[PDB]
Amino acid sequence: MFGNAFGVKKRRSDEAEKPFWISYADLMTAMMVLFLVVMVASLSSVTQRIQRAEQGEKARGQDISRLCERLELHARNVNKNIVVDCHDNRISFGEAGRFAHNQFFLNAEGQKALQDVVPLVLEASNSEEGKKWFKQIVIEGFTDTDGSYLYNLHLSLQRSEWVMCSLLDSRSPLQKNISAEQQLQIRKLFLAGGVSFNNAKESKEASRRVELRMQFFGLKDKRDKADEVDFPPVVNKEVCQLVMPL
Amino acid sequence: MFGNAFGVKKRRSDEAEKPFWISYADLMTAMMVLFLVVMVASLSSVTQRIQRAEQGEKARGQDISRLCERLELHARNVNKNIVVDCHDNRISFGEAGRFAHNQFFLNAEGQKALQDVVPLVLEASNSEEGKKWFKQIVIEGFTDTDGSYLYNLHLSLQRSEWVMCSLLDSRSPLQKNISAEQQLQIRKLFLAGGVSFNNAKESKEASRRVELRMQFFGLKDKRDKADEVDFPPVVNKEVCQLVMPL
Amino acid sequence: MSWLNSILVTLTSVEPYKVPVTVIVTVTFAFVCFIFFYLLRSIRIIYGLKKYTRSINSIEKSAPEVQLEHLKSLFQRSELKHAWNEFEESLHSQYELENGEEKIVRIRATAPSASFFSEQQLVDIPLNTEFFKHLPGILTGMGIIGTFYGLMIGLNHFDPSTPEQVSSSVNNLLRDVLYAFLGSAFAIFASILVTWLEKLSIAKSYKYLEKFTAALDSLYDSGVGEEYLASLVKSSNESATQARH
Amino acid sequence: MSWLNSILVTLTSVEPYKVPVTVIVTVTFAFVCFIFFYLLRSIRIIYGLKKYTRSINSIEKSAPEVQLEHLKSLFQRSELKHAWNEFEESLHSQYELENGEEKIVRIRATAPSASFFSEQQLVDIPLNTEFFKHLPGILTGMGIIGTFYGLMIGLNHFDPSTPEQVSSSVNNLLRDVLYAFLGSAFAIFASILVTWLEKLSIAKSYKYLEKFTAALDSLYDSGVGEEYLASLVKSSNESATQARH
Amino acid sequence: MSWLNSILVTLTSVEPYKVPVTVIVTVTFAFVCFIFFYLLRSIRIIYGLKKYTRSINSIEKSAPEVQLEHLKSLFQRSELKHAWNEFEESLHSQYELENGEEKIVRIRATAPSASFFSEQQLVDIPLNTEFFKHLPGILTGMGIIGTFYGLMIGLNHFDPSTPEQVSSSVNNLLRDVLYAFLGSAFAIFASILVTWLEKLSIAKSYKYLEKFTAALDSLYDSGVGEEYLASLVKSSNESATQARH
Amino acid sequence: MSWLNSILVTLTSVEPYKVPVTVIVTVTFAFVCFIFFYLLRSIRIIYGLKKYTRSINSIEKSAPEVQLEHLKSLFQRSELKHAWNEFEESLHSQYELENGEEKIVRIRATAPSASFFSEQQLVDIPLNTEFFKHLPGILTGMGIIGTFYGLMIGLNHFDPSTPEQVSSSVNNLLRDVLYAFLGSAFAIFASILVTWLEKLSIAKSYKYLEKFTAALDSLYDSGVGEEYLASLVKSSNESATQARH
Amino acid sequence: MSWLNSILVTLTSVEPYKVPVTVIVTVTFAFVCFIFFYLLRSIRIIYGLKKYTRSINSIEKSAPEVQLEHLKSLFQRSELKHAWNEFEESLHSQYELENGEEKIVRIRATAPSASFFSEQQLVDIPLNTEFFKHLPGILTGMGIIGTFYGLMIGLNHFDPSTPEQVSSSVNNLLRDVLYAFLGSAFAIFASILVTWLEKLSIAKSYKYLEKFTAALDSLYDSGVGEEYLASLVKSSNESATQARH
Ligand SMILES: CCCCCCCCCCCCCCCCCC(=O)OC[C@H](COP(=O)([O-])OCC(O)COP(=O)([O-])OC[C@@H](COC(=O)CCCCCCCCCCCCCCCCC)OC(=O)CCCCCCCCCCCCCCCCC)OC(=O)CCCCCCCCCCCCCCCCC
Ligand SMILES: CCCCCCCCCCCCCCCCCC(=O)OC[C@H](COP(=O)([O-])OCC(O)COP(=O)([O-])OC[C@@H](COC(=O)CCCCCCCCCCCCCCCCC)OC(=O)CCCCCCCCCCCCCCCCC)OC(=O)CCCCCCCCCCCCCCCCC
Ligand SMILES: CCCCCCCC/C=C\CCCCCCCC(=O)OC[C@H](COP(=O)(O)OCCN)OC(=O)CCCCCCC/C=C\CCCCCCCC
Ligand SMILES: CCCCCCCC/C=C\CCCCCCCC(=O)OC[C@H](COP(=O)(O)OCCN)OC(=O)CCCCCCC/C=C\CCCCCCCC
Ligand SMILES: [Ca+2]
Numbered sequence A, B: 001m002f003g004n005a006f007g008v009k010k011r012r013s014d015e016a017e018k019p020f021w022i023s024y025a026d027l028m029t030a031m032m033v034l035f036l037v038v039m040v041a042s043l044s045s046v047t048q049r050i051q052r053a054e055q056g057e058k059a060r061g062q063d064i065s066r067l068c069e070r071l072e073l074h075a076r077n078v079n080k081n082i083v084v085d086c087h088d089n090r091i092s093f094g095e096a097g098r099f100a101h102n103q104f105f106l107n108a109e110g111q112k113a114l115q116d117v118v119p120l121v122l123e124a125s126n127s128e129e130g131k132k133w134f135k136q137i138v139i140e141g142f143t144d145t146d147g148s149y150l151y152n153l154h155l156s157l158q159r160s161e162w163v164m165c166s167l168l169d170s171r172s173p174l175q176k177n178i179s180a181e182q183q184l185q186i187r188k189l190f191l192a193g194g195v196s197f198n199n200a201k202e203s204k205e206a207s208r209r210v211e212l213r214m215q216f217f218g219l220k221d222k223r224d225k226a227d228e229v230d231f232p233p234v235v236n237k238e239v240c241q242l243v244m245p246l
Numbered sequence C, D, E, F, G: 001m002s003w004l005n006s007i008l009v010t011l012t013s014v015e016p017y018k019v020p021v022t023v024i025v026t027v028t029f030a031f032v033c034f035i036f037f038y039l040l041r042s043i044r045i046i047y048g049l050k051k052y053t054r055s056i057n058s059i060e061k062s063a064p065e066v067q068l069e070h071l072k073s074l075f076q077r078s079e080l081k082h083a084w085n086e087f088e089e090s091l092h093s094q095y096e097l098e099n100g101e102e103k104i105v106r107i108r109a110t111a112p113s114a115s116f117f118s119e120q121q122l123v124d125i126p127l128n129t130e131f132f133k134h135l136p137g138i139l140t141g142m143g144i145i146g147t148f149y150g151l152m153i154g155l156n157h158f159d160p161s162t163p164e165q166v167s168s169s170v171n172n173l174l175r176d177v178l179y180a181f182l183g184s185a186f187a188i189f190a191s192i193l194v195t196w197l198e199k200l201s202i203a204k205s206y207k208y209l210e211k212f213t214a215a216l217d218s219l220y221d222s223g224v225g226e227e228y229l230a231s232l233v234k235s236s237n238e239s240a241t242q243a244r245h
């Protein structure tokens, strides 16, 4: 009967977010971040030696690729006969390097290409990339498994000896375009010898070929100085001992 | 003034809990646990790969060392002039391996030791260590730095060819001693390498020498039929190419 | 305890795909219940409130008896039937003498119509808002349970023995948690949608209930008790003066 | 500090399985207490409200004195006995002199029935809603405590210090985490189940209490003070007229 | 289930950068909707309330009839027309017979103006404050969905098969985590900004609504019923004395 | 700047054990403050309400005056003394001429006793429930701050500069995480315990205050204004015939 | 997308130390705004309430006119002035002829003092509690935002190209996580400090406002309308008897 019309009531005051839940979300996010970053740091620490070795391997690959590309660019510029396989470090003279049956010489193009490529490879090896990663050059010999074994071995050995003669025989056209230091460098960077058997090609005429396969230091080799030897200055011109007239 | 003091009260509907920070906190709890588990699992796994690679490399090295040790023990048991160096994987000849000027054949002791070491190498490759790691054997020629370079190369290469013949010549005792399978295995193992000129100490007696070294598969190397060149069965005897009046 | 290990291997033996499908089916059934019992119910309530407001606005100029009869015939839904009965109890009919008879000349309001057609009576009880406002939290909780269950399935099957086992176990754990989070994300999306639909529906229900009660309030004038007191005071003064006269 | 290290070795010394077991047992005890003190009690309240509403509807067309006696005999539980006493105080009995005696011809309402059969007194206090609306939060927090304490145990065991025994440390960590998440998931499941049950029960209690108070409000008509004021005003006018005549 | 496997494989193959873009687009749309439907409307409501208050304060010292006409004109072309009509019904005009004509000499308040110009019907319903107090949570839920999904994608792609693959896996994982964190940072920033803006605007709205309803209450005085009762008591005593004399 | 690095060197220089100890000490101090200022106070309030109900349930058959002085002497407490004074002002004493003097025959209630012995005046303000209902959030915040600070200490200690130092660094960081989690777990356990006790105390206090006000409400009867109006109407109706006769 | 990468480069381009600095400065600015706009105002309000209570308790034993003048001069703040005007016009002054002029002999309370000096009017609106109760959540949210932003900067600038680049990037990531921990710790600390200060202030404000309104409630007595009706009934009966005599 005598109620107060002016009695007021509090509004619909919705409460705030409970601070615990947002703080807990903050803490859980911080913990998730901590575990992520600790995993990243730990994995980067355990494998840092592996990472450094892989980086060095990639750098060696880049240097070798650059040197091979420079050498093959020089070959393309100078002589079309010289084709370079940078994938597996092979110098090929396919058409000019064919060997007929039971002979160890080559046509004129074989010698032209060989005596043309030797100075180019010497120049490549004399560069800083060569002075850091280039070892001596291996002459590749190939023989088939048919017939008498030792006849094929003797044929390949005579082919290698003929290649080395042609590189370092008197009156050769290369000898007229060479200096003493370059001749010494050829003597140091080249060894003649090596035989192999393979069945990766469809024709037996392919095995009758010669190739240049340069090989490089490993990452942990790093040009052991004690391995290098020395030769005296040339006192008399070299003479090939294979039977040229045959 | 006309209202009633006995009126309804508590007209206040409770506010519902805000659920989304709760979801955020619980999902980050799950994510934090996931990241912790991935952290520990990834660290353990990477460490296990690293130690597995290290112990595999160590086991391969130990197998190589055991093979070299047993081969050297067998060499001592057979005949004493053999010199085996496990530190560089090289079997050399102490004195019987010497050579004189314009000479291309080992002495009687040298030929005897060369014939004796072959079955030891066959047994070494036969064993489990040989099957697991043993590569083909190359033959390296060594000669002084003096004289004609082509003369030295031809002489050393002739020495290597004569050694290979004595390995596989029909008149040699090996052919009448070994079987067809042993002959094929020798064909697979023994290869001719290059010529080296490691001249030191001004000792021509020990500089001009030939020794055989064995190579081994790497940890990452793969064994496949492409590299496994199979010689056909022997259908005719082999006569060597360098005749005695040479 | 062997009981804990037994219940763990029992719980975690379910296929990891059965967690998201269970969460999705449960959340979808809760959503269908929400749609049927709250969204459709509130839409019908708003439509009825609009129609009633239109009906009330059409008797603004009618006589008090005619509009009273119209309103009595209008309100037949049980909650609004009781609300109208109590509101009409609150209305005060004023009679005057015409042709030697007592007939209603004006109907006065003593309480606002929102006192009887209240938000509770007409919206909150029909919509079960005391329950349906907590549904988003329930959906969120179901999603969280699904994610935790998937994580538990992944963790029970983890094998840290060998590195290959470690990698496969990590893949399986991530796959199970991914299934579970599919279910949980569905639950959170449904929670968002339910929150939006509920809040919009309740706001519009309150809006049109206010419009309906406003239409009902405009028919009757309040403040009759103060007028009666003023009339009594005037009558007392006139009675004193007339006594002396 | 020796004290804190002793505290850690005491806490982490418990077997990890006792953590989810403790959480599950205590949360189940909380659920059982909720069932006994809130759910069954609210079911009894709802049934009582329905029965009382049925009883009130049976005396719609009875004499006011008979209705009053029936309602006095009907309400005997303590809180509704007090509520009925207060409500009967609110009711106004109109007497008329009939056959030489004063008799109640009509009983008038002065306040709504909800003013005494309020939601608070009849639902919220008997059900202890001021406590039970916070029970789901307590359950979720208990699950969270189990989660921290289980991960503390797991992090404590993780200390391999040797590559050979890393697998055992990882296995123990996974087991402890699995225990913690089992406890947390059970606690969250129980919290959402409690939320469902309590909100559904409170909605039904409010709905049926509304029906009960609506049944009580339909017995008695309001607006008697305005009628008394109108009678007084008419009496004053006719008093002046009668004085002059 | 084949459908679940297809859904999982398509959800695993989603580009990681698309999840933060979706989060940003959806949160920006929600923010634009917030600005359009809440913030601009709240600004308009506040400006209108201030304009109304200035209009009311301009008739503090005016005649009561002029005051009533000004207020009716002020609120008649508005949505507050019915609220003003009810408030004016609650106003009691006192009349005195001056120069043979009944004139309004004073106007008395019988109810506060807050009961007609309520917060719900002037602020809460127009602004949809029932929903918009949940929008920060909605944005938080979008953020957690996007973040958990992105982190799951990142962990699924992270699998270093060899120790040489650790670097690339770490780099790609960090990129995926960066995308997930971008999404969450945007969503939570928008959540906090929405909270700040709408809380500040609702505080201003309540403040200016209070200033408005206080300006309405300042015009008219209350307590007229007690004055009428006191006059009646004095008149009764004086009438007894008058009858005797 | 260098300021940030300098302070980070300053903060992360403390021993990891000092942080859980500080969290435990501060949380325990806040819990003791809760027990003293809130729990014991609420217990005293509940026992006082029980004692007061017993006395009121004891004067239920005394004369209205004797009841009135008994209640006046019973209430000696600032809040309850003021509440009793206001409630007694709300009571209407009825006098009838007996033995040539005015003596109280009946005391009538015009407002419910809860309008003066309300929850805010008797429970919420004495217990500072406007503060203590937010204490658990404060406790959990203290625990989270301690956990964060311990995490900074642990992360500052973590630096695996060598592949052989990774396991030791990871184990030490997990130990520091263990410390921080200990702080958080204790804080959250204390917060849950405080919430449980605080909600239970509110429920008990509200129930016993309802019993107290119900006891006070039962002493006095309402409806005096309607009785006075009915008497006035009857007097006017009889006075017309009295004048005529 | 190009847009996403451009956004990432633009956002990440800031220095890592500017994120903790931004969080600390923004949280400190929010704290200073809280101190200036909430804490100092609340302290001023509490001091004013205590002074007003002392003044009201001093004026208890004075004449009604002197009390009215003193209270009118006392309240000068705009909200206090409006509240006092409303309360005073709710007060009923009883005039008696002593002896040739109208003199105020008693002033009666027809409404509680808290109806006009309410918490909403005098504390909640001046303190802007509708905004400031949500500030701690904003502070914690800014801590979370700083965490996410700092980690975004750390992750985007990760450079895996070279091993020492990896080492520097990992060091930057660790510093960024430490920075995020510091910012979160500061944000949560300021949030809980704001919560403590705010809730303590609001509780003390409610306590002292209750004491103040109790001081006003003690000056005047209620129940004047029932006394007037009792006087009217007694006068009617005495008028019947006097007419007969
Ligand atoms: C170990 C495993 C853990 C298990 C679970 C935890 C412990 C058990 C929970 C206790 C509740 C069950 C008790 C029921 C038994 C009988 C009671 C009975 O019949 O009436 C009940 C009562 C019936 O009320 P009613 O029917 O309306 O009234 C008529 C009755 O006759 C009632 O009126 P009355 O005439 O009988 O009057 C008696 C009244 C008298 O009341 C008064 O006069 C005033 C009461 C003031 C309330 C203040 C609370 C008590 C203060 C004690 C402080 C102790 C500190 C605790 C620890 C601190 C340091 C560690 O006393 C009470 O009934 C008080 C309420 C009972 C709860 C308090 C328990 C005390 C025992 C301590 C247990 C120790 C374990 C602690 C575990 C945590 C730490 C390790 O029920 C209710 O009021 C409803 C609420 C029921 C509560 C359910 C609890 C939910 C589960 C929560 C689980 C854990 C919470 C999380 C926090 C832990 C930290 C993380
Ligand atoms: C770029 C896009 C990318 C993002 C996409 C996703 C967006 C996420 C954002 C999250 C939420 C933010 C929204 C903030 C604004 C809304 C606030 C509000 O209340 O607005 C006021 C306003 C109504 O109040 P008012 O200001 O007074 O307006 C004047 C009235 O119209 C007239 O005055 P009246 O009161 O007299 O009117 C009578 C009243 C009473 O009548 C009634 O009976 C109403 C009561 C119950 C309502 C029943 C409606 C059921 C509709 C079913 C679903 C439709 C679409 C759902 C979309 C989600 C699915 C993916 O009628 C209504 O109020 C009915 C209007 C409500 C329907 C709105 C139109 C439908 C969709 C909008 C089309 C535009 C497309 C935008 C993008 C679409 C999203 C992909 O409502 C709107 O117009 C809102 C529309 C804006 C967009 C809403 C987007 C839906 C959000 C749902 C969450 C998504 C979750 C994903 C689901 C997946 C599950 C697995
Ligand atoms: C409204 C949501 C609120 C907040 C949500 C936060 C983030 C959650 C979401 C989503 C995924 C990102 C959206 C991507 C849309 C792009 C569509 C398009 O343009 O192309 C059409 C596309 C062709 O592209 P693909 O062949 O798939 O390219 C593969 C490259 N790796 O074909 C289609 O028809 C559509 C395919 C849909 C792909 C994304 C599916 C996402 C669906 C729902 C998301 C729900 C949350 C995620 C939970 C995951 C738990 C397992
Ligand atoms: C009442 C508090 C409310 C809530 C509390 C929650 C916080 C929980 C945390 C933490 C523990 C604090 C550490 C102890 C405090 C000081 C005691 C002391 O004397 O320590 C000594 C030590 C000196 O050692 P030295 O002599 O230099 O060499 C010792 C080498 N072993 O002193 C210190 O290092 C100072 C420690 C800093 C105290 C500040 C604590 C702040 C806590 C939380 C807030 C967040 C911080 C954010 C800062 C941002 C700045 C812009
Ligand atoms: Ca009206």
Ligand SMILES: [Ca+2]
Pocket: C085, C086, C089, D109, D217, D218, D219, D220, D221, D222
């Ligand atoms: Ca009725």
Ligand SMILES: [Ca+2]
Pocket: E109, E217, E218, E219, E220, E221, E222, G085, G086, G089
């Ligand atoms: Ca006024």
Ligand SMILES: [Ca+2]
Pocket: D086, D089, F109, F217, F218, F219, F220, F221, F222
């Ligand atoms: Ca009573």
Ligand SMILES: [Ca+2]
Pocket: F086, F089, G109, G217, G218, G219, G220, G221, G222
């Ligand atoms: Ca008083």
